[PDB]
Fold this sequence. Notes:
The complex is a heteropentamer. Chain D is about 70% helix and about 0% strand. The longest helix of chain D is centred in the C-terminal third of the chain and has 36 residues, at about 210-245. Chain D has a single domain, classed as Rhodopsin 7-helix transmembrane proteins (Rhopdopsin 7-helix transmembrane proteins). Chain D is mainly alpha-helical. Chain E contains six helices and six strands. Chain E has a six-stranded mixed β-sheet with strand order 2-3-1-4-5-6, with helices on both faces. The interface between B and C is large, with 38 and 60 residues. The complex binds ligand WJS. The ligand CCCCCCCCCCCCCCCCCC(=O)OC[C@@H](O)COP(=O)(O)OC[C@H](N)C(=O)O binds near residues 143 and 267 of chain D. Chain E: Belongs to the G-alpha family. G(12) subfamily. Chain E: It is found in: Cell membrane; Melanosome; Cytoplasm; Nucleus.
Amino acid sequence: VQLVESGGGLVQPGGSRKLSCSASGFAFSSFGMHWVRQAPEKGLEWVAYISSGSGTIYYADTVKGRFTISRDDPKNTLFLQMTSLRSEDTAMYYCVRSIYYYGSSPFDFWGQGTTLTVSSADIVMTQATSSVPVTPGESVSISCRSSKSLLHSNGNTYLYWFLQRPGQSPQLLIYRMSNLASGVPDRFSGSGSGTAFTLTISRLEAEDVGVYYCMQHLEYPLTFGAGTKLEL
Amino acid sequence: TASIAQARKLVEQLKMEANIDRIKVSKAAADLMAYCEAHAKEDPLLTPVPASENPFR
Amino acid sequence: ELDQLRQEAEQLKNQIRDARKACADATLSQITNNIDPVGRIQMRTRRTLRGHLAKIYAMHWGTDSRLLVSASQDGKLIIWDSYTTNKVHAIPLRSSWVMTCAYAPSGNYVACGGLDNICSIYNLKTREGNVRVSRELAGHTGYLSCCRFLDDNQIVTSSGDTTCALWDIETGQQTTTFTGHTGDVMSLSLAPDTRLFVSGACDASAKLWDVREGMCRQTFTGHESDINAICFFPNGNAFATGSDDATCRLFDLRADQELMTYSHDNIICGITSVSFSKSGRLLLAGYDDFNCNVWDALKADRAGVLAGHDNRVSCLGVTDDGMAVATGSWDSFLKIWN
Amino acid sequence: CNVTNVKFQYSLYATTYILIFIPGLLANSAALWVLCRFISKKNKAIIFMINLSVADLAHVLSLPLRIYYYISHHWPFQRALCLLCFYLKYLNMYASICFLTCISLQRCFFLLKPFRARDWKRRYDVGISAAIWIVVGTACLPFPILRSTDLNNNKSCFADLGYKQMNAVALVGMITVAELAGFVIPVIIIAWCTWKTTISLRQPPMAFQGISERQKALRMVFMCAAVFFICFTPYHINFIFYTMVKETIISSCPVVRIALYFHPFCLCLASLCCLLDPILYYFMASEFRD
Amino acid sequence: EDKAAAERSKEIDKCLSREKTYVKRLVKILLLGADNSGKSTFLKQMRIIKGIHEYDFEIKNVPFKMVDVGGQRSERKRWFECFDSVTSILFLVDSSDFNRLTESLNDFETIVNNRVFSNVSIILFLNKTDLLEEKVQIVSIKDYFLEFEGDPHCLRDVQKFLVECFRNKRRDQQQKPLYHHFTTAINTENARLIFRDVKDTILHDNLKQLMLQ
Ligand SMILES: CCCCCCCCCCCCCCCCCC(=O)OC[C@@H](O)COP(=O)(O)OC[C@H](N)C(=O)O
């Protein structure tokens, strides 16, 4: 499995650019794809979505009318065409993979992203803190809150937890508020109830420091939290 | 002597089956009836549940 | 020599017949006279699942009581979600002549087989997002009639050559074989605790097998023609047979003889499938006159009829929680009753 | 001119309609019930036959008010009812003709091209059925529109409504369009289909001696065609002259006498279809009687 | 919301409804014959391409699938006879070896008299057709059948005798037509014969589904 991006660099105000992504090692025509963004010193921000069979296309509120998403299956390629650039478009752009059926695991593989430099009824989610000093061998917890109840009438709670290490792409820890992802050690846990969620890490170890993010997937647009840093 | 081997195999199998501890029919009757009576409350297709807890309606 | 062994076999058969006669001190047809009848049972169709292009031959419920798998004569498996009727997977096979299905207890694998004398095992959870063949088991002489998982590592199969086999999937070699039948074997059923199993094999005879020791323990007789279905009573010490002379029967593994027969004068067609309900009070049977009959297991009367298919009912199953029934027939539809 | 006393026509219509009424109802209702139980098999042609029966049934239900009027000589209702029944009869007759044509064409194509005919679906038949119904319904409007008469005679109805005065050119154009789209095209189609079926049903030999089935099929085809022709030709040959005379265009006395004398018998003959067709199409076959 | 499951299900239905169109054109024929009937040579001389074998080919833009059951066919069990969707059955039977005719007759009357094949027509290929001629001119056919009436050394009499002996084994003759032919090494017209017989079968089916008798 591998996703590799291209197209970044420096651009003048106005003008245009086209970013592309190449996939290898999996069945590209059965997955849906997301474009996500991150400002230089801020949190993550969601940009666009294209579905399998090219049936559904969604944009963010602050990008409609300037951005266009497209895909090509016989060559396994994804395109984002972007025009009329502002200074608020300087960021790092990642491409993300996601498949939906009964019991699947969305957002479970991220690419490596590229850097581009330019010369409400939405749900609100709040992180508790910006940093928490920790010591190895302890048990630590993080929490975040929402402005709505994320529990639906069919029994699912749509809260996701990701971890980003220094210099790397994010990685899925918890999906749908209780479940572990493949290859994640069983010392991570997460639970809570409507409008209050808590993640617990037991027995901190090295290379387990960085920033933690919580996200919702109940209605579009998808929104991220501010970020919690752990310092060792 | 394949016929000898077949006859010996059949004889050994019948000897194995003949030496089985059996019980009376009445005890089997009581056991089946008791099991059916014990779990009667949790059987949905015999005691239909209200539609509020019905996953199919 | 041969004559002495034959005489001893005859003497042992006389001993067995006498031991079975001496134990008949009562019957269910009299003891169950104190049981209140279940009354009239009425069921309605909740969902109808469409999409197969030919006859349907097998199905198997998952262990979460929500997902199920079915196989058809056009050479396909489909994995269905039944709460919403969504299709979750569609798997194309290597040969259109398929006759059996199984669904793994953990949910990671499925299996299939048929007239090609091979049992194929498919993996449902791969990083690439597709379904690929994990193993092919070969070594039987006749076609494959039934297959049931024990866990992710072991499987058991029966053939149309008078044999049964227990296989270790990792190496692909037969761990043990079970022999002794004379005709083709139709069906087998596993015990709830997974220590023994039973099979019926066209002799109007049924045999009980131990998985690990590898020998037959008990043999039951009494039908007049082929045995086409078999299953266990929920507590694992009784089983029910359905045959091709329009008759079902109940056997008990400890008393070593028959208890009841289920048959009515208006049926002149054979059985295709049997199953029990969660508490053991209802017995469901599928027939060749296009309808399904719901019997009261203890009194031996008819409590209900399911009708609505236009052709033979070949598949029939009851969930692990007991809250639904699924039937599959030759008109290429599946129906869910509740 | 010397117009004869045309009075016998009332008793003729009354007796003919009484005779047609009862057995037509019984046969068509039983046939509809029978046909609704063969939809479960793989058969697909049956669709057209369903529609045919429906048309004929609604034909025979349109008679009783005529039987009432032709013997009572009084119409104690409103004019909308008179025009409604007057419209229904002709709508149903022409729908019946169209569906007979479609039946013959399908019957030909499944015997001329046996392999391709396995890719035909029922929804195409439903589409064609609905299109025929709609076109005939919107085409049969001049029958009540143009006879909007007897505004001062509320006791007059089906038989002796007046005639609105129309231009000669428009009237003759309309009558020619009716004649072309009602009689000539179905006749040509049925003749061509009968010929092409007879060529490819008896000519090809076979090893298995099954000549009897081919001959029986040929007999049924020929007899259906003959009944159609004989029932429906005279009315469509006399209608044009009768309508022209009734519109004062034709003034020669002998042809007026002949037309006014002949028309009622042509109507009675054309009205026999709603009784003959159920017997001829599905009370001789072997496979429906179960 | 995670309702992309529904869209995925619709995509799967879009492929099933595509294969449903192809599964209504294919014509399936079940092949049966004797051990020495020249089966291998017959099939290998038609230029086409152990459980069950299947062969595919096309005649006049119609796809034919020939299903060969290689020696498993001896099963006398209903569940094995799951071949009731076939258009017809094709028998290859030898006639030159006079001592093998009884076996072929017993096979034929065992297959044709079964119920499950009531809706399928039957084609009969009398095979090689020339060693029979050589046998007739040297030996008499009366030495094996004390039932023949006629000239023992005329090939035509032998042919009619064999064909009538085969046709007499079946019952309920009018259910579906039985065709027969004589072939030696033609291999080039066999497609024509099979095509014509299947076409006539479909024509008889249409004359009945359309209520013409
Ligand atoms: C696609 C195809 C479709 C088709 C269409 C067609 C067209 C048309 C079209 C149409 C055109 C218009 C014209 C008009 C005319 C009218 C006539 C009539 O009415 O008829 C005849 C008769 O009627 C006369 O009268 P009595 O004689 O009186 O009689 C009465 C009755 N019979 C009753 O009873 O009712």
